């Protein structure tokens, strides 16, 4: 069984590179962030432009949805995060305390906490309601490329250019596990699997790895794509066949069979590094987005 993703929509409007795209949990929307300092909201099924959200003073590297689809949080070169009400476009809170670019962000499933990672080598945990920083973890010795809560919120996984992935106890801020691998190439992305047992980690040696972090064992590797330079998002696709999905520096989207690790599809049509991909929560839809020479988002749809 292989998918047949085909291009259905191209979404123009960002005036610099996109940094990331995320589907809302309720499946209705796609949020995009860009170096052009803006967030844009689009119809997930027809690509219809919905609105522009502004207020960051410098470009944005990441954006994430709350579990009820009502809020966004963004991470910006201006050293802040911003919490936005999606329906009104208003900035509800500005999260201050990082001393360098904020690179990555995420809500916990409860949506009362935000986790962020920054060039300042720290991971910060923020209270959504008050906007205050609850914890600063001296998480890494280089920029923090990704941060993600597990399915029950008790754990955070972080990755860094220092070559490490770390698992943290949310409540205490304490490090539960450090995953090191080979010669510790920069770790450019990480997230938990949907069941919470694995982490998918990208490294800048053109490699994705599925880890049982619980035992410290690499279960799968996904290769054949180009990833040496940028922190490119990877995903679990679970609505049809079980795929791994990633952008690539050869301007393609790659799709691998999760179990066999074979490439099952390469999506062509972007004209620059596909910095970000997202998988729709209920339909076989991929959103992909690219850097400066392209600046567009594409929506692709498959029968399986």
């Amino acid at each position: 069984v292989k998918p047949n993703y085909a291009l259905k929509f191209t979404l123009a409007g960002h005036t610099k590179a996109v940094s990331s795209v995320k589907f809302s949990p309720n499946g209705e929307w796609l949020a995009s962030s860009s170096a052009d300092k803006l967030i844009k909201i689009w119809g997930a099924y027809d690509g219809k432009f919905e609105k522009t959200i502004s207020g960051h003073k410098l470009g944005i590297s990441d954006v994430a949805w709350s579990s009820d689809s009502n809020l966004l949080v963004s991470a910006s070169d201006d050293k802040t995060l911003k919490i936005w009400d999606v329906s009104s476009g208003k900035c509800l809170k500005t999260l201050k305390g990082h001393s360098n670019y904020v690179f990555c962000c995420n809500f916990n499933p409860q949506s009362n906490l935000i986790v962020s990672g920054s060039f300042d080598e720290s991971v910060r945990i923020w209270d959504v309601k008050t906007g205050k920083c609850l914890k600063t973890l001296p998480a890494h010795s280089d920029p923090v490329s990704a941060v993600h809560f597990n399915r029950d919120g008790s754990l955070i996984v972080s990755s860094s250019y220092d070559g490490l992935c770390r698992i943290w106890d949310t409540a205490s801020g304490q490090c539960l596990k450090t995953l090191i691998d080979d010669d510790n190439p920069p770790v450019s992305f990480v997230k938990f699997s949907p069941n919470g047992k694995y982490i998918l980690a990208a490294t800048l040696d053109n490699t994705l790895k599925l880890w049982d972090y619980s035992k410290g064992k690499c279960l799968k590797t996904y290769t054949g794509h180009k990833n040496e330079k940028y922190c490119i998002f990877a995903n679990f696709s679970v609505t049809g066949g079980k795929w791994i999905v990633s952008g690539s520096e050869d301007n393609l989207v790659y799709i691998w069979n999760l179990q066999t690790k074979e490439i099952v599809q390469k999506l062509q049509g972007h004209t620059d590094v596909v910095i970000s991909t997202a998988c729709h929560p209920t339909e076989n839809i991929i959103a992909s987005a690219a850097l400066e020479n392209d600046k567009t988002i594409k929506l692709w749809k498959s029968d399986c």
Partner: peptide, 9 residues
């Protein structure tokens, strides 16, 4: 720009 859209310097 944005950190994610740049390479490490």
């Amino acid at each position: 720009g944005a950190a994610r859209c740049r390479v490490a310097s």
